[PDB]
RNA sequence: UAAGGUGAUAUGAACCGUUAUAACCGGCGAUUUCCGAAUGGGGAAACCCAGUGUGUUUCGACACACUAUCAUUAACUGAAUCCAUAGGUUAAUGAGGCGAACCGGGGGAACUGAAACAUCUAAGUACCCCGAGGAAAAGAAAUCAACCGAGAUUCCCCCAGUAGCGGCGAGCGAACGGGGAGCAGCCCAGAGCCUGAAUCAGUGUGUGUGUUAGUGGAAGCGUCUGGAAAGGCGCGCGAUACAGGGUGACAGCCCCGUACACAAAAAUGCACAUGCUGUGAGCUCGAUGAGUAGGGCGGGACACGUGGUAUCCUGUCUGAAUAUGGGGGGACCAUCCUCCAAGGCUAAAUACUCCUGACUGACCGAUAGUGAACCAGUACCGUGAGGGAAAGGCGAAAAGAAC
RNA sequence: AGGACCGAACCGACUAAUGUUGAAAAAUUAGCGGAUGACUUGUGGCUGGGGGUGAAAGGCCAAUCAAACCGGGAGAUAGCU
RNA sequence: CGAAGGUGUGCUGUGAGGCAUGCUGGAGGUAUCAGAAGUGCGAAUGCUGACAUAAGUAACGAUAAAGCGGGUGAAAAGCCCGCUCGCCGGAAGACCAAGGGUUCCUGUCCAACGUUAAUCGGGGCAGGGUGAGUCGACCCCUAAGGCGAGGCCGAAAGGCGUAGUCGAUGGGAAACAGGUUAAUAUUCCUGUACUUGGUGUUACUGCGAAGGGGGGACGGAGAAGGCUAUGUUGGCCGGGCG
RNA sequence: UACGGUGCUGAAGCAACAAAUGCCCUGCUUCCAGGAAAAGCCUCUAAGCAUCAGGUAACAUCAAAUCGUACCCCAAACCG
């Protein structure tokens, strides 16, 4: 059956990637919480 | 021209294997590990000027590093670059 | 060798620069990775010696 | 500086070798020393198929603590503590109890 | 194995399915309730 | 934004109260109009978004003094 | 500082050094790829693609530097239009982003309580946003008081769960006045006399002290048990040092230290002194903050829910007097007292701990204490925001088991 | 010619049986409907929570939907167990 | 000359408890009298770890199917080789995109992983392996759409959007046959080619744009006609005469 | 012939017929539901440059960088 995760790298990055978190106020606050929690990978880039 | 300070840092090791060996003893090509940011003009110039031979053409691939592990600790090795340097008819090394 | 490099001219540290890279450094990387070169400490001392020549060369040139 | 150091002759104060004199072979940055003929352990090691194969039970010296030795006076013939004085800008060690520079 | 066992015990903790007991177990409880009314 | 360029009147907040005193949030807005003011010393029309008492204070202080205040506080006209 | 070193798992190999250019520690420098405000354009972060100028004795290819936007200032240009403004180009200076809490401001819930609920509460809390500093804010009476007086602001203990506010329910809750911490006043709206007169600010220099490496640092042996002694027994010594830690069991005297006494080539923080620059003292006279105070309507803040409601703030409509004047004194009037708004600056007491050092605990001791004593915000889960583990201890010494 | 006819791929899902601690958190097997169209499909894009989208079922919005998920207010409140 | 702890025994108090001691343990314990509590668990469909129970039970994942000989090995139903048998063959073959990321190939090991054994493996360990002017990306150009100097707007954050700038799933230059590696090949080698730019020489000469025009430039269905891939048969060639 | 293969040599290499859903065909016929854009490409010139620069043609020479390239890919390697 066709499950929910149908992967695509270009949609992974355009959607949840770094240049797209940095592109706005609230994604920069996301990166700030991931750095402050101290996190090995911030976004999902590769 | 390429400066000689750049041109010394490019070639890194001769690559020893059996594909390399049959490339030397069968098709004049010496195979050698180069700098990761080394272009084909740099490798050609560096073999022209550091082994004093005449290079016909260079073919460069980039080899991806293998994820090994020690114990239960993984790690990728490291990517390197391998240059197939096709020499002319007059060569030794 | 730190005062010894300090007392030459810019041209002469460019000469011993290119000879540290040329004669020493490259021939020991090629000699090291082809099964030869029992003496491995030479790699270290050559590398640090190029660091000295570039240091004195930056200090001599201008500021 | 360091009181017990490299080419120095010591006597052993505590354990298994109490009262045995000997010369310090080397001195390890754990705060230990290897002193010759003193703390002999009976290692037995495998004959590795590389370069030479001894096999057998090799009797080595082990590292004893620095605080378990003190340097041998030999003018009194007993153990003696060490101080540091300045003589002509040289920080020298000296024996306590007769105050002699080593 | 321990991590997979904790997550694979954590599988039906936030479920919704009402005809299946505990999210997964098949039954006849629809007919039992419906016949009780 | 709805700011008078002369008096600096933002919209403020408040309550609709009712006869049962039910508090609701509202905004009081300034009476902002975009009026075109002749300046004689420059021989030009400078158009401003004034309140309807920014026009009172322009009628009293004069347009030149007001423009000197806007140029003073970095308000660009 | 130094006789030993080349960081750890983690041994090796190859070496460096031993009286000084091994190594280690500190000050100041040098280098500091790529991404990231990312800033030459772009982009799916760690990649793609340039332009301009300078230089390159194989200049058919290389190397270096500059090129973001915005604000301010200046220069040169420049429309519709004549002058001119808009605009354009270049240069100089500044900003931009991150950060735990504290602080000021712009917005701002609901669950809950009222034994239902709508006024009220929760609560100007949570949260969102802007801005700033080492603190911020406030602050030098258009303030109280009460016919006596006090004398800026802030913080603490009372006042006092008081007066009051309150579907007069639930609840909310002062001030006056008293005791303390700390204490500091000034400038512009404006001319003349007069000048550098105190004042601070920016810098140099000198002194003192502190930080960033360090140095010296007392005094014990015998015997018994024991694998081992620091323990038992016997006899000594130190102490401005018996804080603590280690050492083969419990050490003042074995080791590192502690008390104590000293140490800086260099870079610095603070405090005096002093050089220069800027800045202005002080005197006489004058002025003494207008769409403002007040008002009508709507709303908010004041403990005070519009009530008899003073006072403050203002979205809207209006609108004075201006020292023979005006504000307040809790509706309001008169008498009396007090103060001078519509301009601004100002230390200390105060709040907080991302971070560093020292010390302390009738705090925890591995299901506890941090989620995390261990390569933990990891493994793993989730598209994502996010969620988030388990897992310490051989021995005194690997002597970690030759054969 | 045709929202034409029969019928594979392709899309679907009418019946039955199995399965129901499954081979599978919705399938398999045997039949079944559409199959040039209001079709089907790949790649990218857009719409967002009292909001979207809906040939409308309160359906769908990451195995979640009479109001998603995550985090917070938050130890809500619980005359009840 | 042996603490706490652990595990027995004996004595003792009305009880919670106390005391003595054997063995294990191997370094701490604490009277008395006061003081403070994370102060006493059998229950909370309690939380965490361990271990039972059913139970050596159901099951071992398509009813495409195996049989024998030989080899390797400590051991062979499963591995390798051979001969037979069966299954798919508009797929259960071959080549990719997406996605994964070394699983590829060779040697070596059988602990765990493989629903059994394993000598085997997509498992462990080590080494090797990915070669481009022509393929794809990058690049030039754009769609939907994104972002957006100024700008218009908005309590703040921010919304929209002009110039522009990005954005393929579309438009734009060029390579084919044969051979080869254990593992790459339109990339390496052999042969034969083609494309686009730079520079130089020579001959002729009007060149020149974020500007104008053309072109690129593009629907559904249907119908034949001409072909080819491909196949079948004959001829030819080599082999067989069972 | 390390029996795994490794080299050497190598005949014929034609014709007829059938034939696509591939090619001519981005065609042709027809039908309404009336069927992307922009660049490369070809042309025209404006400002400018005009015995220079540039354009065209031939020849020669140099360059074509960088990253992907293994392997699975209807699957035991992707989503389950």
Swiss-Prot record, chain A:
InterPro entries linked to this entry: Ribosomal_bL34, Ribosomal_bL34_CS
Signal peptide coordinates: none
PROSITE patterns named among the record's database cross-references: RIBOSOMAL_L34
A single GO molecular function term of this UniProt record: structural constituent of ribosome
Gene3D superfamilies: 1.10.287.3980
GO cellular component entries: cytoplasm; cytosolic large ribosomal subunit
Pfam families with a match to the protein in the record: Ribosomal_L34
Keywords linked to the UniProt accession: Ribonucleoprotein, Ribosomal protein
GO biological process, one term: cytoplasmic translation
NCBIfam families (alphabetical): rpmH_bact (TIGR01030)
Subunit structure: Part of the 50S ribosomal subunit.
Record-stated family: Belongs to the bacterial ribosomal protein bL34 family.
Protein name listed in UniProt: Large ribosomal subunit protein bL34
Organism name: Escherichia coli (strain K12)
From Swiss-Prot, chain C:
Keywords linked to the UniProt accession: Ribonucleoprotein, Ribosomal protein, RNA-binding, rRNA-binding
Disulphide bond pairs: none
Pfam family, one: Ribosomal_L29
GO molecular-function terms, A-Z: rRNA binding; structural constituent of ribosome
PROSITE patterns in alphabetical order: RIBOSOMAL_L29
GO BP terms: cytoplasmic translation; ribosomal large subunit assembly
Loss of function: phenotype: Cells missing both S17 and L29 grow very slowly and have a rather unstable temperature-sensitive phenotype.
Keyword Amino-acid biosynthesis: no
Keyword Phosphoprotein: no
Gene Ontology CC terms, in alphabetical order: cytoplasm; cytosolic large ribosomal subunit
Coiled-coil zones: none
Alphabetized InterPro entries for the sequence: Ribosomal_protein_uL29, Ribosomal_uL29, Ribosomal_uL29_CS, Ribosomal_uL29_sf
Domain of life: Bacteria
Function, as annotated: Binds 23S rRNA. It is not essential for growth. One of the proteins that surrounds the polypeptide exit tunnel on the outside of the subunit. Contacts trigger factor.
NCBIfam families cross-referenced by the UniProt entry: L29
Similarity field: Belongs to the universal ribosomal protein uL29 family.
Subunit description: Part of the 50s ribosomal subunit. Contacts protein L23, trigger factor and protein nascent chains. Might also contact SecE and probably does contact SecG when the SecYEG translocation complex is docked with the ribosome.
Protein name (record): Large ribosomal subunit protein uL29
Lineage, top ranks: Bacteria, Pseudomonadati, Pseudomonadota, Gammaproteobacteria, Enterobacterales
Curated annotation (Swiss-Prot), chain D:
Protein name: Large ribosomal subunit protein uL24
One protein family per Pfam: ribosomal_L24
GO molecular function (one): large ribosomal subunit rRNA binding
Family annotation (Gene3D superfamilies): 2.30.30.30
GO cellular component: cytoplasm; cytosol; cytosolic large ribosomal subunit
Signal peptide: none
GO biological process: cytoplasmic translation; ribosomal large subunit assembly; translation
UniProt subunit comment: Part of the 50S ribosomal subunit. Might contact the SecYEG translocation complex when it is docked with the ribosome.
Recorded family membership: Belongs to the universal ribosomal protein uL24 family.
InterPro entries cross-referenced by the UniProt entry: KOW, Rib_uL2_dom2, Ribosomal_uL24, Ribosomal_uL24_CS, Ribosomal_uL24_KOW, Translation_prot_SH3-like_sf
Function: One of two assembly initiator proteins, it binds directly to the 5'-end of the 23S rRNA, where it nucleates assembly of the 50S subunit. It is not thought to be involved in the functions of the mature 50S subunit in vitro.
Protein's UniProt keywords contain Ribosomal protein: yes
Swiss-Prot record, chain F:
Listed GO CC annotations: cytoplasm; cytosol; cytosolic large ribosomal subunit
Gene Ontology biological-process entries: cytoplasmic translation; ribosomal large subunit assembly
Stored PANTHER family: 39S RIBOSOMAL PROTEIN L28, MITOCHONDRIAL (PTHR13528), LARGE RIBOSOMAL SUBUNIT PROTEIN BL28M (PTHR13528:SF2)
Subunit field text: Part of the 50S ribosomal subunit.
Any Pfam family hit: Ribosomal_L28
SUPFAM superfamilies: L28p-like
Species annotation: Escherichia coli (strain K12)
GO terms, molecular function: rRNA binding; structural constituent of ribosome
Keywords: Ribonucleoprotein, Ribosomal protein, RNA-binding, rRNA-binding
Disulfide bonds: none
Keyword rRNA-binding appears in the UniProt entry: yes
InterPro entries referenced in this protein's UniProt entry, alphabetically: Ribosomal_bL28, Ribosomal_bL28/bL31-like_sf, Ribosomal_bL28_bact-type, Ribosomal_bL28_sf
Family as reported in the entry's similarity comment: Belongs to the bacterial ribosomal protein bL28 family.
Name of the featured protein: Large ribosomal subunit protein bL28
């Amino acid at each position: 059956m066709k499950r929910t995760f149908q992967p695509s790298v270009l949609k992974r990055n355009r959607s949840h990637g770094f240049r797209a978190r940095m592109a706005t106020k609230n994604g920069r606050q996301v990166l700030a919480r991931r750095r402050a929690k101290g996190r090995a990978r911030l976004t999902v880039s590769k | 021209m390429i400066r000689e300070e750049r041109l010394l840092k490019v070639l890194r090791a001769p690559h020893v294997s059996e594909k390399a060996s049959t490339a030397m003893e069968k098709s004049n090509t010496i195979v050698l590990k180069v700098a990761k940011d080394a272009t084909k003009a740099e490798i050609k110039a560096a073999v022209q000027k550091l082994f004093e031979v005449e290079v016909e053409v260079v073919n460069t691939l980039v080899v991806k590093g293998k994820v090994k592990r020690h114990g239960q600790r993984i790690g990728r090795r490291s990517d390197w670059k391998k240059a197939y340097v096709t020499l002319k008819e007059g060569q030794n090394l | 060798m730190k005062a010894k490099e300090l007392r030459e001219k810019s041209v002469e540290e460019l000469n011993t620069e290119l000879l540290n890279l040329l004669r020493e450094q490259f021939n020991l990387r090629m000699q090291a990775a082809s099964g030869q070169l029992q003496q491995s400490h030479l790699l270290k001392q050559v590398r640090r010696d190029v660091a000295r020549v570039k240091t004195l060369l930056n200090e001599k040139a201008g500021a | 500086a360091a009181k017990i150091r490299r080419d120095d002759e010591v006597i052993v104060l505590t354990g298994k070798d109490k009262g045995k004199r000997g010369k310090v072979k080397n001195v390890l940055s754990s705060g230990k020393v290897i002193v010759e003929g003193i703390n002999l352990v009976k290692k037995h090691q495998k004959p590795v198929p590389a370069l030479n194969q001894p096999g057998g039970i090799v009797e080595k010296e082990a590292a004893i603590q620095v605080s378990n030795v003190a340097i041998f006076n030999a003018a009194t013939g007993k153990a003696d503590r060490v101080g540091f004085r300045f003589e002509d800008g040289k920080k020298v060690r000296f024996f306590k109890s007769n105050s002699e520079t080593i | 194995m321990d991590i997979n066992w904790r997550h694979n015990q954590s599988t039906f903790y936030h479920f919704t399915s009402d005809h299946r007991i505990s999210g997964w177990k098949e039954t006849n409880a629809m007919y039992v309730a419906l016949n009780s009314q | 934004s709805r700011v008078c360029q002369v008096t600096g009147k933002r919209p403020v907040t408040g309550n609709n109260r009712s006869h049962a005193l039910n508090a609701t949030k509202r905004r009081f807005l300034p009476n902002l109009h975009s009026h075109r003011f002749w300046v004689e010393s420059e021989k030009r029309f400078v158009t401003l978004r004034v309140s309807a008492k920014g026009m009172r204070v322009i009628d009293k202080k004069g347009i030149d003094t007001v423009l000197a205040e806007l140029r003073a506080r970095g308000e660009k006209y």
